[PDB]
């Protein structure tokens, strides 16, 4: 409803000419690539493949979650290009920030469920065949969308458009006064990374050791898949650990130890870079996981 007037502690942090050009360009590239990529992914998995497996359902919802983020990307693009000026009002500020947060939690939760499905599908195929149906997949997906929204609720609540009195700039942001905003950062750290990375590593490690123990008896294909699995974990790890690290470094400035504007400048300079890395490699996630299937790769290639 209203516009609040705010004073900025370290205002000219991350306000550099080269970022104002570099970040909207990368955003444009991710937008163009992600839209047509995940759109063709959805075309292949549902209308072309008919969603006949549980992993198919998770793959569908993964691409559909990424598309929602890509649609709000252009707002951030022109927001960064205008030297951080927000001309879209409070409403779109709310939904765009909630959509970025929602894509975070949704995609990570979906990877978690994909890992459990893979483990149960290879280690315990026959006994988990009956319990792993389509209804449980769709129910799991609605629970994940609900919980991801539930996790991004403080984004809808605490994201506003503020008038920075000391710079005369209208921005879309969080305002930190103490005031316990560190919850919004820990929830990104522990609830958005620590717990799902642990679960994902666990599932793929159980698959790793099962298949190794299987091939030992023969040695006393499946030799490729190990390197593949090592990608999957590390690719998930190294594409989110930059952002997460600087996110943690941001909490120290939100209400604690760091009380400097030069450090704030480095953090605000690097945060969009880490965001770019994270979300570029995230918007490639459905396509990277899909090409791991021979039939999906055949269909997607033929579509080009």
């Amino acid at each position, epitope marked *: 409803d209203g516009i609040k007037r705010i004073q900025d502690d370290c205002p000219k942090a991350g306000r550099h000419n080269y970022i104002f050009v570099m970040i909207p360009t990368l955003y444009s590239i991710i937008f163009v690539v992600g839209i047509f990529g995940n759109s063709l992914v959805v075309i292949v*998995i549902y209308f072309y*493949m008919k969603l*006949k*497996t*549980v*992993a*198919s359902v998770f*793959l569908l919802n993964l691409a559909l979650a990424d598309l929602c983020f890509l649609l709000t990307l252009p707002l951030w693009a022109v927001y960064t290009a205008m030297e951080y000026r927000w001309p879209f009002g409070n409403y779109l500020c709310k939904i765009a920030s909630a959509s970025v947060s929602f894509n975070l939690y949704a995609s990570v939760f979906l990877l978690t469920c994909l890992s459990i499905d*893979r483990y149960l*599908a*290879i280690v315990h*195929p*026959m*006994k988990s*065949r*009956l319990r792993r149906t389509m209804l449980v997949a769709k129910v799991t997906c609605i629970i994940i969308w609900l919980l991801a929204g539930l996790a991004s609720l403080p984004a809808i609540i605490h994201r506003n458009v503020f008038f920075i009195e000391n710079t005369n700039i209208t921005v879309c942001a969080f305002h930190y006064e103490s005031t316990l905003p560190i919850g919004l950062g820990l929830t990104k750290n522990i609830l958005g990374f620590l717990f799902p990375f642990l679960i994902i590593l666990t599932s793929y490690t159980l*698959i790793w050791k099962a298949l190794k123990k299987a091939y030992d*008896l023969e040695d006393n*294909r*499946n030799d*490729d*898949i190990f390197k*593949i699995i090592m990608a999957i974990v590390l690719f998930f790890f190294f594409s989110w650990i930059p952002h997460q690290i600087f996110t943690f470094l941001d909490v120290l400035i939100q209400l604690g130890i760091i009380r400097d504007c030069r450090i704030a400048d480095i953090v605000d300079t690097a945060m969009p870079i880490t965001i770019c890395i994270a979300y570029f490699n995230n918007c490639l996630n459905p396509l990277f*996981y*899909g090409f*791991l*299937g*021979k*039939k*999906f790769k055949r269909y997607f290639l033929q579509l080009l």
Partner: nanobody
Amino acid sequence: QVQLQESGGGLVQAGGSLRLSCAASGNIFDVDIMGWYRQAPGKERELVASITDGGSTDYADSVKGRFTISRDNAKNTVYLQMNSLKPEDTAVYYCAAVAYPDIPTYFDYDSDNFYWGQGTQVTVS
């Protein structure tokens, strides 16, 4: 893709004997794990008995002592020797197999590398 040809169903007395034969057809390489699932009328599907290529077995508690599953790695055929057929065994028995490709990536959005059969009706009188 991978076809499962089943045979050996029909009408049999209580306490009789039957033999279900399921031959996998098509795939160049071997099939990992084959088993049987019975669909009881008006009930859910239930695992009957499974066997791996290495020699591991897994029977259902309801049929422990009465049935016996075996397999042939030469032509990939599974035989469920069903002895002492009680009226609790009347169902549609389906065949199931887990087959992987050559240089297999254990991701499959088509069949999940799980293949079924048409199923044979087994009715115990």
